[model samples]
Target chain A: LPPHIIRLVYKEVTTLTADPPDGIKVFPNEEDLTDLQVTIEGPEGTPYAGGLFRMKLLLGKDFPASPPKGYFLTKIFHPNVGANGEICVNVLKRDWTAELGIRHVLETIKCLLIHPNPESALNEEAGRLLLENYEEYAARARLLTEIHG
Target chain B: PPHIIRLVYKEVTTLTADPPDGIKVFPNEEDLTDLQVTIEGPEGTPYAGGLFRMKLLLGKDFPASPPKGYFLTKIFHPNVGANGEICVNVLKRDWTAELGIRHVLETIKCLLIHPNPESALNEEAGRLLLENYEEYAARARLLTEIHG
Candidate 1:
């Protein structure tokens, strides 16, 4: 099937249909099928509210054999997100289960923004504030959202 | 629902083709062994626009066995080894079976854009960062221009 056709079907069935409505969207690039771009709006009322985060998702040929790599384009300050734009989300990285999907993954990221899990945080400073100081954490979170969102 | 492969494919493709900066893939084992990669420091970066080249060598059984890649070009960084091996989680122990070549390459490209100083593969470089970041950054820029 044509990539455009597959993309059309995927978009209609996934993005255009839900509550909180899967704000996620995928774009096919001129390169290989394993190469693509992803965008997801931050979940509501969360520190990342209204933010449009972009990332690159790359797949290998023998995929499912390993996890896809994700690169955060928008610099968001988070414990799991590194300076290199590499995220430390357990599911996204080494801890992912085989059953996860595109939309589900995006939603998970949105949730992270709204409610960062300090315990498994990759960014220590972000994690410390998230746990030890709510006021300061919220303020910084809001500032980040306003600037990057 | 997408089978595990399909789902992984979806994300890998996205990351590789539309990288924030850019991505490059070494051809095969032979190519990788002789691989010389170049990265230009992004704008606003200490080594902004400066070109940096490095060598990459996927382990003999790559994918199944994570790649054994490193910089051929000398760089003074804590996480990078004297031989240029980078001590990043993704490149080593964190490699997942579902990952593809393109995305792996993209991941490395992203790393080049912003290195991790906390995890040092090279102790001296790491110490330099702790001692005087500005001087290290300056030296790196000079090297990038000269070597790259």
Candidate 2:
């Protein structure tokens, strides 16, 4: 259903283009509407704060049937974010629903930064530190954001 | 958000205002992460006198990660892929976050002059380099004249 998917995506993008969330913007790929480039600022009160993170949101042919895949382009040091920039979040995974809009997904990403659940982590080291040593985790995360944020 | 924009805008301004000779860097109008560059082949190289088109994607990891480089214009070089992809360490393991966009482009420009075959993306070009420098030079020069 390229026709259906394409038109819906266009509509969704049009909505975000006008009134995007604070510090987040989306640009459709030059070649494909299914591929998107996204930017999200590190939320305040987080170790990742003050940094701008880049991410790519890819939609498969399944449209809303499958959750959009989000990958970080910016190397983020987080328990839930993997070395390959894979985001380990329930919103894009087992807990995903077909009705979630692009903005809602982005809000969840910001929330992930604000309140990281190290229990469900992708980076084992980050997960371990966040569990065993909160200070160390915050320090490492801040340093990483300073370097590659 | 402000920090990223400031840094990118600074790069865009300087790059466009006073680009180094034989180099042109044009940041994408819409997205700062994407850039289009043109490099004149360095003198005294087989690719000399030729113009090369290159693309760089800074991604969100930029400033901390090297810009992904590619040769958009066809060229006969070992490090260059058939589909215009370029392979080099400056873009990978050797890269640091502090590295600037200008330096990355310069490195790619140098790659055109000194085609390294340690990891060849073009097997034919790599073979030509080992079998006979004469043939390789001629072939590369031929493409330079034709495409450049």
Candidate 3:
């Protein structure tokens, strides 16, 4: 949006290039720098294990003052993630702060897959399944990954 | 965010690497939205040989809008207010995203050379500029010599 915002982003991209976060990969958009192409490897000990999830982070003019809009490009089945691939997490919403950077966003999304908050459901069935049947929840999620991922 | 950074980084680099004549912008440790600027008054102007400091502040909606400039050093000018803000058309109704900090800085520098007395911030300076040119330049040069 502005030069100051760009400076911060450059440093972040430079850091990502030098020392990317664990299981997270970031690519600067080829045609546009306002969007980031990210691939977050499913965390171990979760149903998403061994799968790759694509995510998009969009920055508007009011970025930093407002958090980037995050979306899952690859279909995901989880209570905190919507069918439309929208992620509902505090880091991207109420708890967001200008101090949080690219690393924080990717790590938070990875954490979301590991610990889906059923109470704040974006997928009603996923919420119900996760709350009542842990085995069923894992099975559905694993199946989704095998088929879609 | 990366894209915005790419665009901004290029602009900032170009500015630092090749600043225009008589213009100096200080480095900002973080970003370029808000900046410290100094412009040497153009030769032959009443403010000649004077260095004027100003603040260029870009809010959340800059480029889409425009940045606001305030004079930190005192100057006797029609377009400059007593409180330090300047009145410029390019920074207001005429602003466009295509205009960068360079454009604005140059415009302010030009303002010193030719003050727009019609849209006056300093009422007395405007009247003096239009009614008696000699007094206007005299007072302006006096202030520039005293504070600039």
Name the runs in model 3 displaced over 4 angstroms.
Answer: B1-148
i-RMS, every candidate? 14.6, 21.7, 26.3
True contacts kept of each: 0.00, 0.00, 0.00
Recovered native contacts in candidate 3, as a fraction? 0.00
lDDT score for candidate 2 against the true structure: 0.73
Sorted into a CAPRI-style docking class, model 1 comes out as: incorrect
Candidate 1 lDDT (Cα, 0 to 1): 0.55
Off by over 4 Å in 1: A1-77, A80-149, B1-20, B26-36, B88-90
* Order of quality (TM-score): 2, 3, 1
Provide the lDDT at A76 for model 2.
Answer: 88
**What fraction of the true Cα-Cα contacts (under 8 Å, chains A to B) does candidate 2 also have?**
0.00
lDDT ranking, high to low: 2, 3, 1
DockQ-better candidate, 1 vs 3: 1
lDDT (10s digit) by residue, model 3, range B1-148 = 4544554556567668877557888757587666788888755557877999998876666567667899998999888888998875535633557666766775676566556567688999989977787788799899999888
TM-score pick, better of 1 and 3: 3
B108 in model 3: Cα distance from truth in Å?
58
For every prediction, compared with the true complex, DockQ reads 0.01, 0.01, 0.01
Q: Per-residue lDDT for A19-86 in model 1, tens only? A: 22245666755445465577767644346656888876565433444555667787677777777877
lDDT of 1 at B18: 55
